[PDB]
Design a binder for this molecule. Sequence first.
Ligand SMILES: Cc1cc2nc3c(=O)[nH]c(=O)nc-3n(C[C@H](O)[C@H](O)[C@H](O)COP(=O)(O)OP(=O)(O)OC[C@H]3O[C@@H](n4cnc5c(N)ncnc54)[C@H](O)[C@@H]3O)c2cc1C
Length: 287
Amino acid sequence: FHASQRDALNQSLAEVQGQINVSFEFFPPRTSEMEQTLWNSIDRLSSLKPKFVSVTYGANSGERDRTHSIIKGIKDRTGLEAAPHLTCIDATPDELRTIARDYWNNGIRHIVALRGALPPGEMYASDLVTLLKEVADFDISVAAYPEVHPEAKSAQADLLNLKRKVDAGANRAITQFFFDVESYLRFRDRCVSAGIDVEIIPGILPVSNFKQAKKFADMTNVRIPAWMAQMFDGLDDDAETRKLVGANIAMDMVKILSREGVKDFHFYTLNRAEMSYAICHTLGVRP
Ligand SMILES: Cc1cc2nc3c(=O)[nH]c(=O)nc-3n(C[C@H](O)[C@H](O)[C@H](O)COP(=O)(O)OP(=O)(O)OC[C@H]3O[C@@H](n4cnc5c(N)ncnc54)[C@H](O)[C@@H]3O)c2cc1C
């Protein structure tokens, strides 16, 4: 019954070996240990020839000189297309055009146009897109929220907002991470209903640390399924078991998403290379 479904999935994944593009998202390191972590991770995950790698920004962090440096260090160490995150926070339309020409002339030809987090304590991503695509013919990725962005009036608005960002001239939508695949599949079908013509690249978060993931999820309004709480229940001190239980969950998801057509994945690495590399191994992405 459910045994032929498993053998078909596993075999049809083994067959999709070489047809899959992967991206890794890093964040700028705070500590000296985390700096070394990042650079090993970039060393490991480079040998997978990812189509690109992104570096998070962080609203009013002031370490855009942390981001810009990393984007350089990546571009020099590895020669991979590094794609920085750019927000509309503590920044005037005047400044951003400069940032854009600073980037474009250093070789940075791909930017992830987000708005950035700074709620009551202005200029929207659609604008920042339109802004960027008249500074130059950039590669632009935008965020998509399969479970609806937390501040969106409703799903319909949020979807229409993504249309707007693509209409403005975004190539790719990279989703928030999600634990219900059904969520994502439905969302991708709405996009095409509502005439959004871009790849809805799923964001995969390999979960080794559930306490941290449970945190990230409440903030971004991302449902943690029943099964998944019970699954991690009891592994609080047990990091080896958490790592296998998490790799399994990611590996199961990317196997199902792969069967469903998805030929592009984006890994929220958290600057840690093993889980991602292993999952990529299962997708036939290998040195
Ligand atoms: C792939 C990815 C990468 C990320 N990287 C970073 C990062 O590097 N740094 C960081 O700080 N955060 C990052 N985030 C988090 C994200 O930037 C925040 O959650 C932010 O609040 C949303 O930005 P946005 O690009 O979705 O903005 P938008 O697409 O503009 O949407 C933001 C909100 O505004 C609403 N909205 C849109 N248009 C209007 C309008 N005309 N009037 C009123 N409301 C409107 C939307 O519905 C939504 O609720 C990332 C998220 C993802 C999925």
